[PDB]
């Protein structure tokens, strides 16, 4: 439950995001900062150094898709379950991804938004985005069993 002030803040900032670029950056930093998450990405090739991770074309390409789904979620803050139901099933049944990883990615995304926007990423705007990333994580986890 974002307040109406929070909802408008999230939307405002997100319009300034290059979703493609930011997606690759967040996924790349996830793999660098928490290197055990590389377990799911053996098909992505070279992830052996920070430079290799950040420069990897598959990381950039996948980051685009991931943050695209995130972006679409922002239009349904009241119904995140509908947006992520199919992806939740995929991440559970096909990909076997521990949903604890979704929290890590959300916090990395918050760090990337802070890095990108600087002072514009104010403490209230961050609080709004923390509610968003927790909501996305919870929705992505909801079909696990």
């Amino acid at each position: 439950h974002l307040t109406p002030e929070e909802k408008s803040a999230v939307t405002a900032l997100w319009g300034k995001v290059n979703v493609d670029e930011v997606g690759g950056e967040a996924l790349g930093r996830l793999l660098v900062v928490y290197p055990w998450t590389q377990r799911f990405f053996e098909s992505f090739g070279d992830l052996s150094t920070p430079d290799a991770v950040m420069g990897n074309p598959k990381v950039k390409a996948h980051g685009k898709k991931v943050l695209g789904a995130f972006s679409d979620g922002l239009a349904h803050l009241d119904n995140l379950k509908g947006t992520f139901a199919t992806l939740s099933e995929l991440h559970c049944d096909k990909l076997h991804v521990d949903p604890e990883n979704f929290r890590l990615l959300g916090n990395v995304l918050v760090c990337v938004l802070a890095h990108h926007f600087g002072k514009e990423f104010t403490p209230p705007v961050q609080a709004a985005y923390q509610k968003v990333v927790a909501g996305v994580a919870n929705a992505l986890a909801h079909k696990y069993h």
């Binding site: 055990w36 377990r39 076997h96 604890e100 696990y144």
Partner: protein, 141 residues
């Protein structure tokens, strides 16, 4: 850190487990999979049903590793070196899951040690499992 009293407590409780070690490891695993279904994501190659050979076999491995940690309680980082390598570099289990299994191991011990699972021993076992968990995640990054 584990106090002399902790080490005494752990050695006594784990000593009473004895040959039931494998059984209790499998039971703790089952408890974990049922109570915390996300932990199943680490075992897609397992048949996870009650009684399964893979769960029994893995339960014995976990328990035996714990027995080894108890046998080398003053130097667990060395005693568990190969295991911490394996979890950090290969298995790559998110650290929160160690808390889940640790709790399920405590519950299993409680359910099998009506006499030994005193408040003081409960406290010492929990410290021990958190210590093992810390060692097992010590090489993650």
């Amino acid at each position: 850190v584990l106090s002399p009293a902790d080490k005494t407590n752990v050695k006594a409780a784990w000593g009473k487990v004895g040959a039931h070690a494998g059984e209790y490891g499998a039971e703790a695993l089952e408890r974990m999979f049922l109570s915390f279904p996300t932990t199943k994501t680490y075992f897609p190659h397992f048949d996870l049903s009650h009684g399964s050979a893979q769960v029994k076999g893995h339960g014995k491995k976990v328990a035996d590793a714990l027995t080894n940690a108890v046998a080398h309680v003053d130097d667990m980082p060395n005693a568990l070196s190969a295991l911490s390598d394996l979890h950090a570099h290969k298995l790559r289990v998110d650290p929160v899951n160690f808390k889940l299994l640790s709790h399920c191991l405590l519950v299993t011990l409680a359910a099998h040690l009506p006499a030994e699972f005193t408040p003081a021993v409960h406290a010492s076992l929990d410290k021990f499992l958190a210590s093992v968990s810390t060692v097992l995640t010590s090489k993650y990054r």
